[PDB]
Amino acid sequence: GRIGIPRERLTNETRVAATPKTVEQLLKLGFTVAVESGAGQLASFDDKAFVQAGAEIVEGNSVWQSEIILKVNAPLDDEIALLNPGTTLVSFIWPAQNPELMQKLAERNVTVMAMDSVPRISRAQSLDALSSMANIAGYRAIVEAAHEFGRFFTGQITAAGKVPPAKVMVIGAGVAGLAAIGAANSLGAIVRAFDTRPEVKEQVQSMGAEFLELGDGYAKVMSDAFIKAEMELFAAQAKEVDIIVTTALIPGKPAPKLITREMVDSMKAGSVIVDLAAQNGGNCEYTVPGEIFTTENGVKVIGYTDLPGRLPTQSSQLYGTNLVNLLKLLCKEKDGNITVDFDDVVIRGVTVIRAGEITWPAPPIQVS
Amino acid sequence: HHGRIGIPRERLTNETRVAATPKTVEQLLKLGFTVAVESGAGQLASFDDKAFVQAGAEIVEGNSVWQSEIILKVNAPLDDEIALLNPGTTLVSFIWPAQNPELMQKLAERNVTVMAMDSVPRISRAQSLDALSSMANIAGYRAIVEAAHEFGRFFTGQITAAGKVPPAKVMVIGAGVAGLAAIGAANSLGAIVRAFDTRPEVKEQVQSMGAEFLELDSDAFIKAEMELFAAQAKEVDIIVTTALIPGKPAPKLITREMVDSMKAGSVIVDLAAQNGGNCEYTVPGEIFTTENGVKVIGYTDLPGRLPTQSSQLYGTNLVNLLKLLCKEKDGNITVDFDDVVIRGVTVIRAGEITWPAPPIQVSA
């Protein structure tokens, strides 16, 4: 029952699937652990920190001689061949967006658990890698914004006068949005947030932010009238806020253009936009994914797509913990053995390949 | 023109600040002056020509800015700028007369008056003019912004579904203006802050910010001070060090061995870098990453990395000096050497060197 933690080989990836702390937890579940030399380096975990935790350090491709492989990103083409039959791989996969990856992994005769496919039910929250990375992203977004911003975020009285607080608008109050509201409010900004779902109002307000206000709900938010009013709201806000964080991103779909060139052009010089939808084209029309773009009117549009990789220690610890929590479901006894029980809707949801046969997608959850 | 203030574009390599903003321009006109800003002077600080024009300034090209009765700058004029200073002009900028006798001589020969913003006496009624404090305040804030950007973990403690994350631990060395601003920024990010200062009178300030005022236990004092830092280096994630006296080599307070003992991924922001740094690993102008994975931030331009704020506060410092110099609000400068504040700041008066000012009793 050996778990292998490979070094992440996707260029510029800084995260690792286990930390010294998560390795201790993995051993308490009866597994042994091998970590590939250098795997945690960019996340500030040296080989010897892993050895202190009770892992064995291995070089080269011998980490792939393991019953279980825990990774962040999916095996590259040249890593798929190193998966041996009967191995359980746990990583991000994105099966819906990667049919060819699925076929390649299936031929290897492994069991694959995609961390993007954890069911969004209450009991799976300790396993939800998407929420873990989103929460880090929202915090990191405000750090990135403070870095690029040329003014105090924090209102204060100095001898040379009273400085006002920065004004921050956050579009989308899902997990990333809320984290951004939280970090912004801690820095003493006047925070404002918009979300199409009225249910989140009370949550947004408890964090200290203003909830912005403008045939089922779905039709409503899709209608020309609502979309016109929403664009008007954003145009007006753009004129008075210093920082905008946009988070409206659905996996696999192009991101909606909520912040147009014209809105950004209306902004005060030195303002910052952090576009957390950059990996799907961005919520902002000026966004160049992977980069900061500066407009003619002096606005910095931040479009990095690796915010969690920019908090690599935190992301590795939280993601690693998500994996521990999945393995707690897989290994209820002492004991180092994995049981893929499809009667557990969380397991069923996450398991996208089982012994060489594609089991994705799972059915709608319908429980008695 | 008489009563015209010229705001030149800064020429110093990589300078992003400007000596006036649209808001200070509004204040300057309220004092009876007119204002010419050299085109682009505010660009790097996010003040475009149009914002100055909207505030009431006139935009001028290159040299025209020097045809003003008053010139406000950040950095001292370069040789080719000095030659464009006309007799009777009043120049306000950082000057650093001790470090620059040659410059003092060249300005004197132009028969100008010079107010050195580094020479504001450290008495309480001059706080609103103290450009050194404005900049130190900015640097402490920005030091924490740089630390958070480079740090690979949450500063802020947090309960998550995937675990409870403790807050970052921050040690600030020196609780003068910059140290206190660092404390404040770190607090805003939810960090546990500890601070050390040799002056016991800052204890209540530090404790009032919810920070721990570290205690000890001349060669006995230094050794116990180094033992505190060595012990704290093993526990904290971020060290901000601020022990700097203008014109003097910075004491090495954090040694290579101390940094070598820290948790990997830790960050040091060394605000004494411009005088060699308090950290032995510091490389002024750069981040140096140690073999054990600690980032040592040695930037010497923290205020230039917050240029909009730096310009605003410094520009206000200049307004407040002109409020003293222009009591009638009529666009006329009157230098009154009975006021110790003006006597201190005035380093050349109409061609005559007046620095150093007679000895004075002060603060800190």
Side-chain angles (χ1 to χ4, degrees), chain A residues 44 125-126 132 135 139-140 143-144 146-147 149-153 159-160 163 186 269-270 311 313-314 318 321-322, chain B residues 46 127-128 137-138 141-142 145-146 148-149 151-155 158 161-162 165 188 264-265 306 308-309 313 316-317:
Chain A
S44 299
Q125 262 312 121
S126 79
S132 275
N135 182 238
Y139 164 90
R140 186 61 199 189
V143 167
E144 295 291 340
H147 197 259
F149 200 41
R151 292 166 190 269
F152 285 153
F153 248 75
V163 181
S186 80
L311 213 68
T313 308
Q314 208 53 76
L318 298 194
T321 294
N322 289 318
Chain B
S46 306
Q127 282 162 350
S128 77
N137 188 237
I138 299 288
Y141 171 91
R142 186 64 198 186
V145 163
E146 299 292 346
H149 190 70
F151 191 49
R153 285 174 200 262
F154 286 139
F155 250 67
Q158 216 176 257
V165 180
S188 297
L306 204 74
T308 308
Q309 202 64 62
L313 304 191
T316 301
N317 290 143

Side-chain angles (χ1 to χ4, degrees), chain B residues 90-310:
Chain B
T90 295
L91 165 66
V92 193
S93 78
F94 289 112
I95 293 292
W96 304 102
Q99 289 72 49
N100 301 277
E102 345 68 328
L103 166 68
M104 287 294 281
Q105 190 47 41
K106 283 173 251 161
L107 293 157
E109 292 167 3
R110 307 304 303 159
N111 285 320
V112 293
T113 292
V114 184
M115 310 289 170
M117 291 309 282
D118 49 289
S119 305
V120 177
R122 290 170 277 120
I123 67 176
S124 300
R125 72 164 184 267
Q127 282 162 350
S128 77
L129 304 212
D130 195 324
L132 294 173
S133 291
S134 284
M135 289 313 79
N137 188 237
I138 299 288
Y141 171 91
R142 186 64 198 186
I144 290 305
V145 163
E146 299 292 346
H149 190 70
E150 303 290 334
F151 191 49
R153 285 174 200 262
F154 286 139
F155 250 67
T156 317
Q158 216 176 257
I159 301 157
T160 81
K164 213 167 330 284
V165 180
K169 291 179 201 181
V170 184
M171 180 174 50
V172 178
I173 300 175
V177 174
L180 291 178
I183 292 159
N187 281 159
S188 297
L189 293 171
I192 288 150
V193 187
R194 301 152 187 191
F196 180 81
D197 200 284
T198 65
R199 302 163 288 153
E201 46 259 27
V202 308
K203 185 165 161 297
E204 288 77 32
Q205 226 160 176
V206 172
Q207 291 183 328
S208 71
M209 296 176 84
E212 170 182 12
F213 194 70
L214 298 171
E215 312 174 317
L216 302 158
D217 237 323
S218 22
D219 297 321
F221 191 86
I222 283 178
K223 167 178 159 255
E225 193 175 340
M226 300 299 263
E227 281 175 349
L228 171 64
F229 303 157
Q232 285 291 328
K234 294 182 256 257
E235 302 187 346
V236 303
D237 304 292
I238 312 301
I239 299 173
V240 177
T241 189
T242 71
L244 190 64
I245 292 160
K248 184 194 244 105
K252 306 302 168 224
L253 299 179
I254 294 154
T255 63
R256 285 185 177 80
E257 274 189 83
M258 284 183 207
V259 183
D260 292 339
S261 75
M262 300 182 79
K263 191 190 250 221
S266 301
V267 182
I268 301 177
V269 195
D270 188 349
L271 270 59
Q274 57 265 44
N275 297 184
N278 299 321
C279 184
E280 290 186 333
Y281 271 131
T282 295
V283 176
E286 300 176 45
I287 304 186
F288 177 83
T289 300
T290 63
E291 266 181 82
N292 69 310
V294 170
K295 299 180 165 161
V296 188
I297 303 175
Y299 306 143
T300 52
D301 65 335
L302 293 160
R305 295 175 188 259
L306 204 74
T308 308
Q309 202 64 62
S310 290

Side-chain angles (χ1 to χ4, degrees), chain A residues 180-199:
Chain A
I181 290 148
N185 186 261
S186 80
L187 277 168
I190 287 161
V191 187
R192 300 172 189 168
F194 174 73
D195 194 277
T196 58
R197 306 165 290 148
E199 316 101 65

Side-chain angles (χ1 to χ4, degrees), chain A residues 131-282:
Chain A
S131 285
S132 275
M133 301 298 97
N135 182 238
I136 283 160
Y139 164 90
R140 186 61 199 189
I142 295 299
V143 167
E144 295 291 340
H147 197 259
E148 276 306 293
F149 200 41
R151 292 166 190 269
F152 285 153
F153 248 75
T154 314
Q156 48 200 100
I157 197 159
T158 75
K162 184 170 196 180
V163 181
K167 290 167 190 274
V168 179
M169 183 179 56
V170 177
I171 302 183
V175 169
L178 291 170
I181 290 148
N185 186 261
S186 80
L187 277 168
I190 287 161
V191 187
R192 300 172 189 168
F194 174 73
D195 194 277
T196 58
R197 306 165 290 148
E199 316 101 65
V200 307
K201 170 153 162 188
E202 294 86 12
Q203 208 162 340
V204 168
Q205 289 184 148
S206 59
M207 311 210 116
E210 193 188 344
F211 193 65
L212 294 168
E213 316 277 38
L214 304 170
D216 69 350
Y218 187 109
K220 205 184 102 231
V221 309
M222 290 307 282
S223 68
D224 282 340
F226 185 98
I227 286 174
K228 181 232 200 148
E230 189 189 5
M231 286 323 74
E232 284 167 1
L233 196 230
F234 298 158
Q237 287 298 323
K239 286 190 203 172
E240 57 171 327
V241 305
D242 310 291
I243 315 295
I244 299 173
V245 176
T246 58
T247 71
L249 163 113
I250 299 284
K253 281 296 289 179
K257 304 336 210 128
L258 311 177
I259 314 291
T260 60
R261 285 185 167 75
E262 288 69 38
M263 296 168 190
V264 180
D265 291 335
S266 90
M267 296 194 72
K268 179 152 101 164
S271 294
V272 177
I273 297 166
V274 190
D275 193 342
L276 299 219
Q279 51 231 330
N280 284 193

Side-chain angles (χ1 to χ4, degrees), chain A residues 11-59:
Chain A
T11 305
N12 293 350
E13 180 60 78
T14 55
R15 308 173 286 176
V16 61
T19 67
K21 264 180 223 104
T22 67
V23 161
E24 294 197 284
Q25 294 175 283
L26 286 173
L27 268 40
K28 288 195 145 230
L29 302 176
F31 305 101
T32 55
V33 181
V35 177
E36 179 175 5
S37 189
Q41 201 75 58
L42 289 167
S44 299
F45 298 118
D46 280 21
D47 289 352
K48 68 213 222 266
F50 282 109
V51 173
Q52 180 166 185
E56 176 182 10
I57 302 284
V58 305
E59 335 239 329

